């Protein structure tokens, strides 16, 4: 089983993965596994014996652009299939950017972070008065590590 990359349209990787799964189910394809992480945008991973099976399976789908010639080592995608909260690795005192939520497109500074409630507390840097707000841990992205 070798890992290959399939480039797809951004925002609909899950739909293309489901289409490939249906094609494999109804067409007897030698496909071993398909992975589509939510963090990775526009690409999916396919575990298959060879790249030829990958390009044959993705053939006929207009939303699958191409298959990258290289082979991804399993250590690169090992961390993807690991049970780990998104709030891990976030320490207070740094600066983050909020991807989604009511504060979309805003930079803030982490004040309190907890992993039990899968939430984080951030103070807006643009706010003149410091008012902490809570936002989901997966809704932020680290921009600069500081204490």
């Amino acid at each position: 089983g070798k890992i290959f990359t399939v480039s797809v349209t951004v925002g609909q990787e899950t739909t293309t993965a489901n289409l490939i799964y249906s094609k494999a189910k109804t067409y007897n394809l030698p496909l071993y596994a398909i992975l589509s992480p939510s963090k990775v945008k526009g690409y999916i991973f396919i575990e298959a014996p060879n790249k030829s099976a990958v390009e044959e399976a993705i053939r006929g789908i207009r939303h699958a652009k191409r298959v990258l010639p290289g082979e991804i080592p399993f250590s690169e995608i090992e961390h993807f299939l690991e049970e780990k909260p998104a709030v891990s690795g976030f320490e207070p005192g740094d600066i983050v950017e909020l991807i989604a939520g009511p504060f979309k497109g805003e930079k803030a500074k982490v004040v309190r972070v907890d992993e039990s409630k899968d939430e984080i507390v951030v103070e807006l840097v643009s706010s003149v008065v410091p008012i902490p707000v809570t936002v989901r841990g997966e809704y932020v992205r680290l921009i600069s590590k500081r204490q």
Binding site: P102, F103, L124, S127, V133
Partner: protein
């Protein structure tokens, strides 16, 4: 939290179908803000008489809005014709708009009294003959840009407004009539200080914010410029989204300055209950504040889109209208008398459990512009009162001889051919000066034109748009008589700097009402610069002057004020025109006025909280009230919680 809105709606529908006739065809019953909306298929049998609607409103304790179901709807191009035919031609209808998503017709007319009806029967007849629920608004005789912008925003965002109103109605009626275990009053600002007022009414079920404001004087220090956001109760309320409503006492920067800041960072998503004049004046003042903050070079507090969001989240409440704003809290607004739309907030918590009356800024003596403050309530237990002039020696001079002195000074200035420049606030004393001048000129005393410059025209237009919020004399003049005091030909407005230069260069006597009391900005500075060297002119100050400003410098008798002119060179203003100070037109209650309000309030409150003033003045007022009447008076600082019940 759990919600019982579905059960309440089901029982309301059951009560309706028990009482309302079956042939009316009740289809949907929902909550829009604090009101109950019922959609019908046969409005003819629904409102054959107003007695049924009144009985339904009394039994349900809801603001009943009966609208035709969207299944049947007359075409707008024909509905306009039927509305024009049905409405008498005396009421000049200016605009007709249709909302088909929820069946509504907005009629913007110059005479809403004829459109609404003698007892509301004209609206019922219109919505019976045309099958469109009517809402009548007043066409201002003087066109206002802010009111037109607010109406356009409310019209073009009907979907978002309807969704917000539906979610507000669902949040308000999450449970039935609930008796609160405890009632608490917390001051996040404006306690033992002037400005940045903020009140928090806390129960075990709902939380209510009152007149969230900003401190203009202490804007350099963020700690004192804004209400305390570090309060654990406020942090809990804003963090968990438990703020049920925000009520603004009156439209001013110390009571509504920080309102768009919550919507700028999406800290609040509920409704803001306020009177329509308060709403329009608050948006005007917020826009002006943002403009001067952006001009001064500092970062603006919020964007105009935040003011637009505030407009979209604003619910208009008239005087004396009781609305359910929280499962245990009912809100009503009474005439404060301070400015246009100024409202004393009466919060009734529980079924007779407690009653709070937050006066805010108010005036008790009967002024020409506004009626005296309402001192009678159905029930009163806690009274929160302003203490701006709560000192023992704080005694404002009476209005009669103050206006006599102003009139005689203006007459002496115009006798020698000079020009009268009257710096004033955007709202409040400026319109009072206009009314005094109009009363003086109506008898033939002066025929010179009066020029209104720098947003005073906008405030005058807003005042014209809401004449029912004015005094009894002005209401009698406007409604019963055909004479509008604001529509006098003497009142003129400029269009650009060319008209201002023409006014300055004109040799005829004239009266100019400026826009800034401090002469800090607006056309006031230009008028002062171009009229100071002429000794025939005069300047009248109707407001307090702040140290370090041009107004205080010219009031202190400085005959030569050095200022930064063009080309970066110091140019001196040789002040030869007469300087007068008549500060008797302040809209704040006097110490005698506060004592009279305390003595004449009905019923007597159990406790009085003296806020909105300096700490020494607040303590003096509380001690004086306690010594005179025996009522328990408190003057707590910020971040102080008082358990009323």
């Amino acid at each position: 939290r759990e919600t019982f809105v579905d059960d309440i709606l089901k029982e309301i529908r059951e009560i309706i179908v028990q009482m309302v006739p079956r042939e009316a065809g009740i289809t949907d019953v929902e909550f829009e803000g604090p009101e109950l909306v019922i959609y019908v298929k046969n409005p003819e049998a629904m409102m054959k008489d107003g007695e049924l609607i009144k009985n339904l409103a009394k039994v349900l304790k809801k603001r009943i809005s009966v609208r035709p179901d969207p299944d049947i709807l007359l075409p707008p191009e024909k509905a306009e014709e039927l509305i024009k035919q049905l409405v008498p031609p005396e009421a000049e209808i200016t605009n007709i708009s249709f909302d088909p998503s929820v069946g509504e017709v907005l009629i913007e007319a110059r005479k809403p009294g004829l459109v609404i009806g003698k007892n509301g029967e004209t609206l019922r007849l219109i919505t019976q003959k045309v099958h469109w629920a009517p809402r009548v608004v007043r066409t201002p005789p003087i066109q206002s840009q802010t009111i037109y912008s607010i109406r356009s925003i409310l019209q073009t965002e009907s979907k978002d407004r309807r969704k917000f109103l539906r979610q507000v109605g669902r949040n308000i009626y999450r449970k039935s009539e609930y008796k609160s275990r405890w009632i608490r009053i917390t001051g996040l600002g404006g306690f033992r200080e002037v400005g940045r007022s903020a009140l928090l009414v806390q129960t075990d079920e709902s939380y209510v914010l009152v007149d969230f404001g900003v401190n203009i004087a202490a804007l350099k220090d963020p700690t004192k410029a804004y209400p305390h956001f570090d309060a654990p109760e406020f942090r809990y309320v804003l963090d968990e989204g438990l703020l049920d409503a925000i009520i603004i006492t009156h439209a001013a920067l110390d009571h509504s300055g920080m309102l768009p800041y919550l919507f700028r960072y999406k800290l609040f998503d509920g409704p803001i209950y306020t009177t329509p004049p308060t709403r329009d004046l608050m948006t005007l003042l917020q826009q002006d504040f943002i403009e001067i903050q952006h001009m001064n070079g500092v970062e603006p507090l919020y964007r105009p889109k935040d003011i637009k969001e505030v407009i979209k989240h604003t619910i208009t409440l008239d005087y004396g209208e009781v609305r359910d704003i929280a499962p245990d809290i009912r809100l009503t607004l009474h005439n404060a008398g301070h400015i246009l739309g100024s409202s004393i907030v009466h919060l009734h918590i529980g079924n007779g459990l407690h009653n709070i009356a937050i006066t805010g800024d108010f005036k008790f003596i009967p002024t020409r512009l506004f009626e005296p403050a309402v001192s009678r309530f159905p029930r009163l237990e806690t009274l929160v009162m302003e203490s701006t002039y709560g000192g023992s020696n704080d005694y404002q001079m009476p209005r009669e001889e103050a206006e006599k002195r102003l009139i005689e000074v203006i007459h002496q200035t115009l006798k020698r051919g000079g020009k009268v420049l009257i710096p004033a606030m955007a709202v409040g004393r400026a319109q009072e000066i206009m009314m005094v001048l109009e009363e003086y000129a109506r008898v033939g005393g002066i025929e010179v034109p009066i020029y209104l410059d720098g947003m005073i025209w906008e405030a005058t237009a807003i005042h014209t748009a809401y004449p029912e919020y004015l005094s009894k004399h002005i209401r009698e003049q406007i409604f019963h008589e055909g004479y509008n005091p604001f529509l006098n030909p003497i009142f003129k407005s400029v269009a650009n700097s060319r008209e201002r230069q023409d006014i300055i260069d004109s040799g005829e006597p004239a009266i100019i009402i400026a826009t800034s009391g401090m002469l800090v900005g607006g056309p006031s500075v230009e008028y002062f610069k171009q009229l100071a060297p002429d000794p025939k002119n005069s300047i009248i100050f109707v407001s307090y002057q702040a140290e370090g400003t041009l107004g205080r410098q010219v009031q202190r008798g400085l005959r030569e004020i050095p200022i930064v002119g063009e080309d970066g060179r110091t140019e001196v203003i040789n002040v030869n025109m007469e300087v007068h100070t008549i500060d008797g037109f302040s809209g704040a209650a006097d110490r005698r006025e506060l004592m009279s309000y305390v003595a004449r309030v009905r019923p007597r409150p159990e406790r009085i909280i003296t806020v909105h003033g300096e700490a020494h003045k607040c303590l003096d007022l509380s001690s004086s009230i306690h010594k005179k009447f025996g009522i328990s008076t408190r003057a707590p600082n910020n971040l102080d919680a008082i358990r009323l019940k």
